[PDB]
Scaffold this motif. Structure first.
Motif, short mmCIF file in Angstrom:
data_model
loop_
_atom_site.label_atom_id
_atom_site.label_comp_id
_atom_site.label_asym_id
_atom_site.label_seq_id
_atom_site.Cartn_x
_atom_site.Cartn_y
_atom_site.Cartn_z
N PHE A 216 0.82 -1.20 0.00
CA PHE A 216 0.00 0.00 0.00
C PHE A 216 0.86 1.26 0.00
O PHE A 216 0.53 2.23 -0.68
CB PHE A 216 -0.94 -0.02 1.20
CG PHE A 216 -2.19 0.77 1.01
CD1 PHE A 216 -3.21 0.29 0.20
CD2 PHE A 216 -2.36 1.98 1.66
CE1 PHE A 216 -4.37 1.02 0.03
CE2 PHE A 216 -3.52 2.71 1.50
CZ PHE A 216 -4.53 2.24 0.68
N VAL A 226 -1.12 10.30 4.41
CA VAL A 226 -1.64 8.96 4.20
C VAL A 226 -0.61 7.91 4.58
O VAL A 226 -0.94 6.88 5.16
CB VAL A 226 -2.10 8.80 2.74
CG1 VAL A 226 -2.78 7.48 2.52
CG2 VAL A 226 -3.04 9.93 2.37
N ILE A 230 -1.09 5.35 7.56
CA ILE A 230 -1.05 3.93 7.24
C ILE A 230 -0.09 3.19 8.16
O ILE A 230 -0.41 2.11 8.65
CB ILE A 230 -0.69 3.74 5.75
CG1 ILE A 230 -1.95 3.76 4.90
CG2 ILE A 230 0.05 2.45 5.48
CD1 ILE A 230 -2.94 2.67 5.24
N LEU E 13 -7.57 3.98 8.30
CA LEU E 13 -7.45 3.20 7.07
C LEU E 13 -8.49 3.61 6.04
O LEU E 13 -8.19 3.66 4.84
CB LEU E 13 -7.56 1.71 7.39
CG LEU E 13 -6.38 0.85 6.97
CD1 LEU E 13 -6.57 -0.56 7.46
CD2 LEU E 13 -6.23 0.88 5.46
N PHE E 14 -9.71 3.91 6.48
CA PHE E 14 -10.75 4.34 5.56
C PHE E 14 -10.45 5.72 4.99
O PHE E 14 -10.74 5.99 3.83
CB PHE E 14 -12.11 4.33 6.24
CG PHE E 14 -12.69 2.96 6.46
CD1 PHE E 14 -12.14 1.85 5.86
CD2 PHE E 14 -13.80 2.80 7.27
CE1 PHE E 14 -12.67 0.59 6.06
CE2 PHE E 14 -14.34 1.55 7.48
CZ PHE E 14 -13.78 0.44 6.87
N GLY E 15 -9.86 6.60 5.80
CA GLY E 15 -9.42 7.88 5.29
C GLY E 15 -8.28 7.75 4.31
O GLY E 15 -8.19 8.51 3.35
N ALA E 16 -7.39 6.78 4.55
CA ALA E 16 -6.31 6.50 3.61
C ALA E 16 -6.86 6.02 2.27
O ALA E 16 -6.42 6.48 1.21
CB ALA E 16 -5.37 5.46 4.20
N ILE E 17 -7.84 5.12 2.30
CA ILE E 17 -8.47 4.62 1.08
C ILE E 17 -9.23 5.74 0.38
O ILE E 17 -9.20 5.86 -0.85
CB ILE E 17 -9.38 3.43 1.41
CG1 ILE E 17 -8.54 2.24 1.87
CG2 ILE E 17 -10.24 3.01 0.23
CD1 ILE E 17 -9.34 1.02 2.25
N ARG E 19 -8.62 9.05 0.55
CA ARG E 19 -7.66 9.97 -0.05
C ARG E 19 -7.01 9.37 -1.28
O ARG E 19 -6.79 10.08 -2.27
CB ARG E 19 -6.59 10.34 0.97
CG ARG E 19 -7.04 11.31 2.02
CD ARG E 19 -6.73 12.72 1.60
NE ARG E 19 -5.31 13.02 1.72
CZ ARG E 19 -4.79 13.79 2.67
NH1 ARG E 19 -5.55 14.37 3.58
NH2 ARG E 19 -3.47 13.99 2.69
N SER E 20 -6.70 8.08 -1.25
CA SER E 20 -5.98 7.47 -2.36
C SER E 20 -6.88 7.26 -3.57
O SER E 20 -6.45 7.48 -4.71
CB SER E 20 -5.36 6.14 -1.92
OG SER E 20 -4.51 6.33 -0.80
N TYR F 46 -5.52 16.08 10.28
CA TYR F 46 -6.08 15.08 9.39
C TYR F 46 -6.79 13.97 10.15
O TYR F 46 -7.90 13.56 9.80
CB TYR F 46 -4.98 14.50 8.50
CG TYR F 46 -5.37 13.24 7.77
CD1 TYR F 46 -6.20 13.29 6.67
CD2 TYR F 46 -4.89 12.00 8.17
CE1 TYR F 46 -6.55 12.14 5.99
CE2 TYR F 46 -5.24 10.85 7.51
CZ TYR F 46 -6.06 10.93 6.43
OH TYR F 46 -6.40 9.78 5.76
N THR F 50 -10.81 13.24 10.15
CA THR F 50 -11.28 11.91 9.77
C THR F 50 -12.17 11.31 10.85
O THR F 50 -13.25 10.78 10.56
CB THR F 50 -10.08 11.00 9.50
OG1 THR F 50 -9.22 11.63 8.54
CG2 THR F 50 -10.54 9.70 8.96
#
Lengths: 1038, 57, 56, 55, 68, 57
Positions: A216, A226, A230, E13-17, E19-20, F46, F50
């Motif tokens: 990822f 991000v 992560i 993780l949902f915010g990462a998904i 954003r991506s 951030y 979120t």
């Protein structure tokens, strides 16, 4: 109103005060944090408001204490580790941490049972030993990092601490579930399954989450947040899911996840890497501060009401016994540890014994014993003895580990490091004196208080019997320029001169390797291996940096080429549809493993549409297996076999991609180490004339260097021949990385020149950073090009399609097997030989020996100068060559005469090739690398000497003038120059004689360029009014 | 600024001129050599390199 | 700027000393970087000397 | 308000032209190296392409 | 067992998904985060385990929400 | 916390003024710590955004 904010922020401020006020004192900040926590605890016991705050914070749940604080500490300990040095000595770390932890826990349990007055059984005593054996040295690791030598010992101690903490929490959890929360009974099969589950499915679960996290992170570009999110979410999710939803040891999972993410640091962007290092250090600092404050509060609130004088005596005897036990453990494992390649000395053993500092992991496990024991006294004794041994280890072992490193002799600053630091300080001082003499004569800063400026700018040197005798021997070894007395050598002083020259050669090799790393040519690990080999070779009697120890970097041999060839032997949109059908039918396997499960999922989608109509009637041995699966389906386990066969035939090429990636990762390190050795030997041979003054020593060192260079070049050529496609992939990776690094340097030199402002330069640097990150996720095996693509990508041939067509029309692919001779030394030049496969050997009496490989052209100077050949070429493998004959080359010369001509391009290639040693010889002393010389020479142009009457005037705009072929006369015909030579500053005008069989060539470079602040231009709007673009970038206008 | 074309300067020495010439010499050789000599002093803590030479045998 | 120096002398001396010290330390930082690029000083020793100039 | 100004367009175009000529020089150097001569240069030229952000 | 860790890390993780997967789309990641939160809320209203997690997290005290 | 809880002070305006002053006196922080602090507070905001949006949904 959350009082946790007041406790957390007060702990942060108290830790700030503790760190700031105790920089100079050797007592650490953790023990004074514990004292401040004890003061806060008795204040809370008196005053009820502080009781409210510390009562709702420090009297925490045990599970939430572990689940919040342990992943941070374990992940920071794994992320701060140097993973390559950890894995090079993984055997010693593993056997020491695991076996020493289990025998130290057993011995501490036995000591506790037979010495403490409490009636502890073996399970609570093993809990005590698990807490006592968990070590967290950080100050010792810092001290061993900054104090020069024993670099490996710091990695040994840190890795042993990390695995010790992980396995200590594992055995603590096992015996805590033995004592407190259950007391159940189970069979031996369930016990061995539970042990297997913890000790195996810890690291496997950590590996799975770490691989998903690395995948990822590899595909995230241009947002750091991000990536940090992560990493943090991956750590906490791994620990929580493993420890709670499964019965997996989550500590080992976070250990493996941290080690893998530390190994795959190239998947993170470098600014995010720097942020992640400082961020996890900050989180571990906050976790340590909170744990130490909480431990102090609960120790002086609850654990100090059961302490007696016999308890204090037992604490002192416990500290002595824990030190003696750890020393005896390291002493008994000293034979097995000494049988491995980094054998522990007695000094390293004493540092490992005395660097057993207890810490926050043991304090947290003592706190959860205290909170799980309840009103029983066992938790009070656990917490008191853990806090006491933490305080005692911190105070005594920190102060005496500084004094013990000073006494045992490991803290001495080495003589070459002392010389290098003294030279740096002297350069700093003369630069400051120059800056002061400039600044005193400025029209604005003339009246400054210069006493204060000289006092504030003073970079002192940080490093201020046998040593004086040894240094006196070295200065007796080198009289040189300071003595200025001629003499003749003696057979003892000859050996002295040879030894000093060997040391100087090795030091210059180390300098060349660091120059390669600083200019973005080497990787980090190749630099580490090369400087380690140079430092090891500096310690033996008369050895240089050998080739046989450098072979182990590029030894690709292992299970991986065997797996590659076997899976390639097994391999050699409808398939995507069948794979999608198998992936969709994967879920009814989990369903069958209600209307009888909806008629068994409608007979498993009618046998998956009868295996997609038997794969469309076999599209009108793998097909035999598919037919067997269809016949079995015609006759649940049939579905399982069909799904696993589809999974196997789909997942085989992904396995060859993984094997290609592993071979690529090893081959990249091998190519980097070999190329670093070659470039270092070339640079040190350019600067060996100044250092080594004795001619016999000069010839011996040059002979050794040339043998090493030839051996490494031959090994790398054969290594390319073993795996061709992966070699093409690593060469393309290095080429793209070089181009993007020089584009980054160009953006920086435009930013420094002011032509590009900071925001636009940041946009362009963002583009090159995205391109580097996409370069990391490249294919690991680019398929090798045919001979036609190699012929179209020759430097001179490459520009023009018509010349490509003509040469391809008149090429001739010739094949020579092993041991044959392609061309002789003395015969006429009959044509070129572009090597499209294999490796050759250029024996020549120029003795010039060289190995050429795929992509090199032999005979360009021969077919231009119409001269007899220089070196004979013998094949070392099966060599395929493209033989462009001399007649074809001459008629191509006579045919193509545009503004870039074939003559100009050919002579430019051979002019760069013959001008690189001259500029490197005359200008290595100004710190110029070979790549910088090639780039500076690539900006040049040959002079049409037939245009300007065969006489040439060297004006001030020319930087370097190199005559490539022919003879020249200089100035007012003062002398003649008849060789490849760098025409110096003394020559002002060159007058070339024009005759037959010479036709002289001259290569000039013209004074960088005028980066015009002007920069006027013209755009033109096009259709749709979106392609409005500047065309005539001029920078020279009215 | 005496340019690249000039190779040798011949100054006339007379009264009321006494000419002055300022030259800069090609950065410096940052010697990878860097040999030197220390000397231990009293209390065995001030051991310091004295003769940074970078030009030796 | 000359009259401005004449209005407040001591503060002018302080700002001139600040700029002089900053120039000297910036060029010392550049010298440490050019020694690091030349390989004469390795990364750890150069980081020690850069830490000294950052503290200053 | 989202239009790119003419001097900024000129400065970015000059920077992109300097980048392109530097990459062409680096490519001509790297094609004549004794180690990196057999690299797939189509992929290298495709991957190293700093296009102008303002077209 | 603190279920706040599962909600916080799942939100990360949902915010990462979010954003991506929505770099190119002009719709921001906050509204698709809100949609994913609504899906998690109705899943929690149906399934009691997600009810346990989101109930002890999202039904927060007001003062601690502001103060954090 | 002290402004909103222990006193009756509007703590939001206090954090506004504290952030503006620390942003004004950025030279009191070391520059590597300045870069870290910028990315760190962006990361914390951030995570806060979120969590708030998920909780609101």
């Amino acid at each position: 109103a959350p009082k946790v904010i007041v406790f957390i922020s007060g702990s942060c401020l108290f830790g700030a005060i503790s760190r700031s006020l105790f920089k100079k004192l050797p007592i650490p900040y953790t023990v004074v944090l514990l004292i401040l926590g004890a003061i806060l605890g008795v204040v809370a016991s008196n005053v009820p408001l502080v009781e409210e705050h510390t009562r709702d914070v420090a009297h925490m749940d045990p599970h939430v204490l572990l689940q919040i604080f342990l992943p941070v500490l374990i992940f920071e300990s794994a992320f701060a580790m140097d993973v390559h040095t950890f894995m090079r000595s993984f055997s010693q770390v593993c056997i020491l941490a695991l076996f020493g932890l289990v025998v130290a826990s057993v011995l501490t349990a036995v000591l506790a049972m037979n010495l403490f007055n409490y009636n502890w059984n073996f399970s609570e005593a093993m809990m005590f030993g698990a807490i006592m054996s968990a070590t967290d040295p950080v100050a010792v690791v810092a001290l061993l990092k900054d104090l020069g030598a024993s670099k490996q010992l710091g990695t040994i101690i840190e890795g042993e601490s990390l695995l010790n903490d992980g396995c200590a929490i594992v055995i603590f959890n096992v015996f805590m579930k033995m004592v407190f929360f259950p007391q159940l009974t189970s069979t031996v099969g369930q016990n061995v399954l539970y042990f297997l589950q913890v000790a195996v499915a810890g690291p496997l679960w950590g590996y799975a989450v770490a691989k998903v996290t690395v995948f990822f992170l590899s595909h995230i570009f241009n947002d750091a947040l991000v990536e940090i999110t992560i990493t943090l979410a991956a750590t906490y999710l791994t620990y929580y899911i493993g420890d709670i939803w499964l019965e997996v040891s989550g500590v080992l999972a976070v250990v493996v996840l941290g080690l893998i993410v530390n190994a795959e640091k190239t998947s993170i962007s470098p600014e995010v890497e720097v942020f992640l290092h400082r961020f996890w250090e900050m989180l571990a600092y906050l976790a340590n501060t909170l744990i130490f404050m909480m431990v102090g509060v609960v120790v002086t609130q609850k654990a100090l009401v059961a302490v007696d004088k016999m308890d204090w005596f037992y604490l002192i005897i416990l500290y002595l016994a824990i030190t003696i036990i750890r020393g005896m453990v390291i002493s008994l494992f000293s034979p097995i540890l000494s049988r491995i390649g980094y054998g522990l000395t007695w000094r390293n053993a004493v540092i490992m014994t005395w660097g057993g500092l207890r810490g926050a992991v043991g304090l947290a496990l003592a706190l959860v014993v205290e909170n799980l024991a309840g009103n029983d006294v066992i938790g009070s004794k656990f917490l008191f003895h853990t806090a006491g041994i933490v305080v005692l280890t911190l105070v005594i072992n920190a102060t005496t580990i500084q004094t013990l490193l000073r006494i045992l002799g490991m803290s001495d600053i080495s003589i070459p490091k002392r010389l290098a630091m003294a030279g740096a300080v002297r350069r700093i001082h003369e630069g400051q004196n120059r800056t002061l003499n400039m600044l005193k004569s400025d029209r604005f800063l003339a009246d400054a208080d210069w006493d204060i400026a000289t006092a504030a700018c003073e970079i002192s040197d940080p490093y201020s019997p046998a040593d004086e005798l040894t240094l006196g021997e070295r200065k007796s070894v080198c009289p040189g320029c300071k003595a200025m007395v001629p003499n003749e050598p003696s057979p003892r002083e000859f050996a002295d001169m040879m030894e000093e020259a060997r040391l100087r050669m090795l030091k210059a090799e180390k300098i060349s390797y660091w120059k390669q790393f600083e200019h973005g040519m080497l990787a980090r690990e190749a630099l580490r291996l090369l400087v380690q080999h140079a430092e090891v070779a500096a310690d033996e009697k008369d050895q240089f940096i050998l080739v046989d120890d450098l072979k182990k970097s590029w030894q690709i041999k292992g299970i991986y080429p065997w797996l590659k060839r076997k899976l390639e032997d097994l391999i050699s949109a409808f398939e995507v549809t069948i794979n999608i059908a198998i992936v969709l039918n994967i879920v009814p396997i989990i369903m069958e493993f209600q209307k009888i499960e909806d008629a068994l999922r409608i007979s498993n989608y009618v046998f998956f549409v009868i295996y997609a109509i038997e794969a469309i009637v076999k599209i009108l041995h793998w097909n035999k297996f598919d037919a067997f699966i269809l016949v079995v389906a015609l006759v649940f386990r049939l579905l399982r076999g069909l799904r696993m066969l589809r999974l196997t035939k789909a997942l085989i090429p992904k396995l060859i991609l993984v094997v290609n990636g592993k071979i690529n990762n090893q081959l990249s390190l091998g190519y980097d180490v070999g190329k670093g050795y070659i470039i270092g030997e070339e640079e040190v041979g350019k600067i060996i004339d100044r250092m080594v003054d004795n001619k016999k020593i000069l010839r011996e060192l040059k002979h050794i260097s040339e043998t090493g260079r030839l051996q490494v070049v031959k090994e790398l050529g054969l290594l390319q021949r073993e795996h061709p496609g992966i070699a093409v992939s690593v060469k393309t990776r290095q080429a793209i990385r070089t181009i993007l690094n020089h584009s980054r340097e160009t953006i920086h030199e435009l930013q420094g020149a002011g032509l590009l402002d900071e925001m636009e330069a940041h946009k362009l640097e963002l583009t090159v950073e995205i391109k580097m990150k996409r370069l990391m996720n490249a294919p690991s095996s680019i398929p090798p090009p045919p001979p036609e693509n190699l012929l179209k990508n020759v430097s001179w041939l490459a520009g023009d399609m018509k010349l490509i067509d003509f040469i391809k029309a008149r090429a001739s692919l010739l094949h020579f097997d092993y041991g044959e001779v392609i061309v002789r030394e003395g015969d006429e030049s009959d044509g070129l030989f572009l090597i499209v496969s294999g490796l050759v050997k250029l024996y020549g009496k120029s003795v010039f020996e060289d190995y050429l490989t795929v992509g090199n052209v032999i005979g360009e100077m021969g077919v231009l100068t119409k001269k007899p050949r220089n070196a004979t070429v013998t094949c070392e493998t099966t060599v395929q060559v493209y033989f462009i004959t001399a007649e074809d080359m001459n008629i191509a010369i006579d045919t193509f005469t545009l503004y870039p001509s074939l003559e100009y391009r050919l002579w430019r290639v051979v002019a760069i090739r013959i001008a690189t040693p001259l500029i490197m010889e005359q200008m290595a002393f100004q710190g110029w690398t070979q790549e910088k010389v090639k780039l500076h020479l690539e900006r040049g142009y040959l002079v049409d000497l037939a245009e300007s009457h065969f006489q040439f005037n060297i004006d001030a705009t020319l930087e370097d003038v190199i005559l490539i072929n022919g003879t020249a006369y200089n100035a007012h015909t003062r002398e003649e120059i008849r060789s490849p030579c760098l025409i110096s500053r003394t020559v002002h005008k060159l007058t070339f004689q024009y005759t037959a069989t010479e036709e002289p060539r001259l290569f000039v470079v013209r004074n960088a360029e005028y980066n015009g602040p002007i920069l006027d231009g013209r755009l033109d709007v096009d259709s749709k009014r979106s392609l409005i673009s500047i065309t005539e970038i001029s920078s020279n206008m009215c």
